[PDB]
Amino acid sequence: NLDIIGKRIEKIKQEHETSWHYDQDHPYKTWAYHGSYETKQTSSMVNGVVRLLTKPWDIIPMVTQMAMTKEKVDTRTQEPKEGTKKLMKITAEWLWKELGKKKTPRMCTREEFTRKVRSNAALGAIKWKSAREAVEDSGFWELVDKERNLHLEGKCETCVYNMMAIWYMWLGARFLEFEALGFLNEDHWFSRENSLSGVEGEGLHKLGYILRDVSKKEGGAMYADDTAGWDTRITLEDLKNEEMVTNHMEGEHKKLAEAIFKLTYQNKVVRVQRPTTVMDIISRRDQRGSGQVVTYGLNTFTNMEAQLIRQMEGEGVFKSIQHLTVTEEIAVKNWLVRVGRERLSRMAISGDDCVVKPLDDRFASALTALNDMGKVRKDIQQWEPSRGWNDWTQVPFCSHHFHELIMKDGRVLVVPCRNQDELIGRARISQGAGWSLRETACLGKSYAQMWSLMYFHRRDLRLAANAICSAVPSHWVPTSRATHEWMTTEDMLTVWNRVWIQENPWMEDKTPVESWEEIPYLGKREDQWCGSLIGLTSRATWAKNIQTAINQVRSLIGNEEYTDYMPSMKRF
Ligand SMILES: C[C@H](N)c1ccc(NC(=O)C2CC2)cc1
Ligand SMILES: [Cl-]
Numbered sequence: 001n002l003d004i005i006g007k008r009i010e011k012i013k014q015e016h017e018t019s020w021h022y023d024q025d026h027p028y029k030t031w032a033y034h035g036s037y038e039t040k041q042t043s044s045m046v047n048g049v050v051r052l053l054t055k056p057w058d059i060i061p062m063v064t065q066m067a068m069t070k071e072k073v074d075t076r077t078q079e080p081k082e083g084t085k086k087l088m089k090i091t092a093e094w095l096w097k098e099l100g101k102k103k104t105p106r107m108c109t110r111e112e113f114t115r116k117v118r119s120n121a122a123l124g125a126i127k128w129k130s131a132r133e134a135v136e137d138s139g140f141w142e143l144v145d146k147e148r149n150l151h152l153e154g155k156c157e158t159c160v161y162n163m164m165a166i167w168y169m170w171l172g173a174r175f176l177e178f179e180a181l182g183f184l185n186e187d188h189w190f191s192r193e194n195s196l197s198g199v200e201g202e203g204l205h206k207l208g209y210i211l212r213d214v215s216k217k218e219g220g221a222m223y224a225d226d227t228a229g230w231d232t233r234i235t236l237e238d239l240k241n242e243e244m245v246t247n248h249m250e251g252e253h254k255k256l257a258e259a260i261f262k263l264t265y266q267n268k269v270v271r272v273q274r275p276t277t278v279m280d281i282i283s284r285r286d287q288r289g290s291g292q293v294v295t296y297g298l299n300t301f302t303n304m305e306a307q308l309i310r311q312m313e314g315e316g317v318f319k320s321i322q323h324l325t326v327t328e329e330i331a332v333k334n335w336l337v338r339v340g341r342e343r344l345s346r347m348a349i350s351g352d353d354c355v356v357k358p359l360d361d362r363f364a365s366a367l368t369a370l371n372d373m374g375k376v377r378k379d380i381q382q383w384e385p386s387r388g389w390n391d392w393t394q395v396p397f398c399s400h401h402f403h404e405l406i407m408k409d410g411r412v413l414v415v416p417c418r419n420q421d422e423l424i425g426r427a428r429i430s431q432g433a434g435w436s437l438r439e440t441a442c443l444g445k446s447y448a449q450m451w452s453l454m455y456f457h458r459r460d461l462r463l464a465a466n467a468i469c470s471a472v473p474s475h476w477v478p479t480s481r482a483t484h485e486w487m488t489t490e491d492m493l494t495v496w497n498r499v500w501i502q503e504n505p506w507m508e509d510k511t512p513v514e515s516w517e518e519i520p521y522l523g524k525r526e527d528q529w530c531g532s533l534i535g536l537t538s539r540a541t542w543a544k545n546i547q548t549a550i551n552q553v554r555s556l557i558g559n560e561e562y563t564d565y566m567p568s569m570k571r572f
């Protein structure tokens, strides 16, 4: 409590000593409330290039509504039973060891962090305006040093969350989290090769092949239960099991990592704007409050742990979660040592998102440990058995399903897919404003090249992608604000051959493809089923008159070097 958070709280009061009021109509029951001060401050814009080249979608409500525009955060998960706590501690210990077998924890550097902000990544930050300026500035780094020495002392002053649910910190606090825990992401601890259940850095062009490899194992159905608000269901017990990564560390790193876990995770402080505008300073010891990248890695870890325990329950490794016997602890340990790795290989896990192919379908009704860890399944009654999938091409994972698509030469593509309304509606939105015509065009080109690489097998996206790349100057570089092989000025057929043939470990014959017409689509009915507008009069007019749309956008951007990509299609 206040011994660890006082300094942060005390500091904030003093900066707004001419506003501090301890309001008694504060909406908080779970969150600890400390005080309030005076504040007054705060949407998605449409990409006109993508929209002008996707006119049929102007009348599809699923597309157009995506561009318009709580009581989950203010909740508390109960303390798990003692047998649940033991299962979790034993499993967490074994899993950190397995992840650490071929990796060395290590500090991440200012140089690494500096290069990260100069290249623009979503670091979620807030004397300086841009984070680029601070990295260049040198007082900021003295500010970092002060906090750093404070962390070594066992104290914290400026590591405070701002809710808006995404929790931004000042860039200095992000540095210190990245210094301590950045190795998890930077050194690929959750790669499939090192974690077995993981998919970090794999790419959407690999996920479908990975699900198909899981399908090949003997077992029962494939289960893909989503958790109801995963971040809100992270217990202090989960935070303490995650902290055990510091047991693999040494020297300063160990102290710095212990400090982030103790001070910024296990005992948080947040400033939330309440319109009644006032800034409430509240605190809590549980729930997920980190950086989006460390959040990913620790969500993956705790999800792997929860799913191995659910598997153990389905195999009857333990009887009851209320209490674990000394023989049952022995059995859990022997299971992990004898089949732990095999059971990890039966899963694909990406943060909160999982697919499990258990040994058999007893897993479907193995609910006691899962419910008691507080990982309550979304949209199903607490004690109703999971509905599993019998076909790997039906299984949802990372917002996608995967099709098996056979090339005219017999080689097999496993391709990612989702409702086409979702793909078109996302490409039509630009995050933040201040965008030039050129920047908006380069974002449209990023979507177009992504569609050519991942969604080529959809007829409407190949056409629209060719149109947008025809409408945007040939040499303009794609921008943004997975592995992203579409972010390049190289020829998109050359990248396709590299990603789908040369570098594709499931493709034995490495014969290059010479043209886009060699590259197949879904079935006409599978395409429409997935949402193609084909067969519609509004769509055929768009395909027929596409050069007119292209020319409208060329006229707006002006007199530039353009390429006609439309003849890559045999029809044009
Ligand atoms: C080969 C090229 N990808 C292409 C172009 C248009 C269609 N559209 C249909 O077949 C609609 C009428 C039912 C199919 C394929
Ligand atoms: Cl199915």
Ligand SMILES: [Zn+2]
Pocket (backbone or CB within 6 Å): 147, 151, 155, 156, 157, 158, 159, 263
């Ligand atoms: Zn701090």
Ligand SMILES: [Zn+2]
Pocket (backbone or CB within 6 Å): 401, 403, 417, 418, 530
């Ligand atoms: Zn599909």
